[PDB]
Design a protein around this ligand. Structure first.
Ligand code: 2IG
Ligand code: NAG
Length: 333
């Protein structure tokens, strides 16, 4: 099965899923960076404005709902959500699985008021599941209907005309329609995390970063490519970028000229051009231009690690192989 994804300003990729009977729909981000499923709850006080602006699942309208109520708190690098567990049938572009998800009752205005999506579907391993809840992919695999134990991601570039698909996620394989050349796999450092060994990072012709090696987290639920506060400060100085509050800007006229940034993974340089990582929204020297790379200190046991999010996936079609515990990359088409 494949799921059409909507691309919102190149920073948010989501698709639809139905929960309960009759189906209650939600826009969700398929996150290889987390392992739980959650959507806003009707029990969420309207004092939480974010709940006022998103779809809320109502248990009392689902004849297939199974109560549980165990509390859970999900913690992401850029925000937190809290609530309790519930069970019901979830629809994912064809497949139907009885999933255990979290009904969020605390959805902070900042940042969720900025979210176009309603919730999250974790595509990570159970080792990272909060509350030891079985991840949705594990369940789908159990059904034994998928052609292969893998899922692929395709994140298209932004578009000013609602006629091109913002992205697509395939359950059980890849879609040749969106990649060229062959994949090039890398082995997961440790199973339970979509993290691989990254040999080095280069900014132009001078591998000034991640020498000696470092970690790379392939996060479909993250907007940009991130690095330790240290690594980024050093990468950003090399680009002549200034550090703002939430991002790094560069004078727009200097954006097209910026150097390439390469990530050495499994022996193959994945190169990104300035056009690939800069939000060139102007050419004025009197305007600032946001870079699609941020600084995000990810704690143990996962970090310190770089995070390859949407900025990286837009250029490289990614396939997550559960059966071989490996990640594959191919030129996105
Ligand atoms: C999908 C959940 C998620 N997973 C992971 N691994 N990291 C995150 N930082 C987030 C997380 C949390 C809140 C918001 C969040 C809140 C408001 C606006 C945008 C937001 N984004 C970016 C969406 C990127 O989609 C590809 C968020 C991401
Ligand atoms: C909630 O689900 C977990 C997972 O199986 C289960 O162990 C627990 O007993 C459930 N709690 C209730 C009260 O339904």
């Amino acid at each position: 099965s494949s799921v059409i994804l909507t691309n919102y300003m190149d920073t948010q990729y989501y698709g639809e899923i139905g929960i309960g009977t009759p189906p209650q729909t939600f826009k969700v981000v398929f996150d290889t960076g987390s392992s739980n499923v959650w959507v806003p709850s009707s029990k969420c006080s309207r004092l939480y404005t974010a709940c006022v602006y998103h779809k809320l699942f109502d248990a009392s309208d689902s004849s297939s709902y199974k109560h549980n109520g165990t509390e859970l708190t999900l913690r992401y690098s850029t925000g937190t959500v809290s609530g309790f567990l519930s069970q019901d049938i979830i629809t994912v572009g064809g497949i139907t699985v009885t999933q255990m998800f979290g009904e969020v009752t605390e959805m902070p205005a900042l940042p969720f008021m900025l979210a176009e999506f309603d919730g999250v579907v974790g595509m990570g391993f159970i080792e990272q599941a909060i509350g030891r809840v079985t991840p949705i992919f594990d369940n789908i695999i159990s059904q034994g209907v998928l052609k292969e134990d893998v899922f692929s991601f395709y994140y298209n570039r932004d578009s000013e005309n609602s006629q091109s698909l913002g992205g697509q996620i395939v359950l059980g394989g890849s879609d040749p329609q969106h990649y060229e050349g062959n994949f090039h796999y890398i082995n997961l450092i440790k199973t339970g995390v979509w993290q691989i060994q990254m040999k080095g990072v280069s900014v132009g012709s001078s591998t000034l970063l991640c020498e000696d090696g470092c970690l790379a987290l392939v996060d479909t639920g993250a907007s940009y490519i991130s690095g330790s506060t240290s690594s980024i400060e050093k990468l950003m100085e090399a680009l002549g970028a200034k550090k703002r509050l939430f991002d790094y800007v560069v004078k727009c006229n200097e954006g097209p000229t910026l150097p390439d940034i390469s990530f050495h993974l499994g022996g193959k340089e994945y190169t990104l051009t300035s056009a690939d990582y800069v939000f060139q929204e102007s050419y004025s020297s009197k305007k600032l231009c946001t870079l699609a790379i941020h600084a995000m200190d990810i704690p143990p046991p996962t970090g310190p690690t770089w995070a390859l999010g949407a900025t990286f996936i837009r250029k490289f079609y990614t396939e997550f192989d559960r059966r071989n515990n490996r990640i594959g990359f191919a030129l996105a088409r």
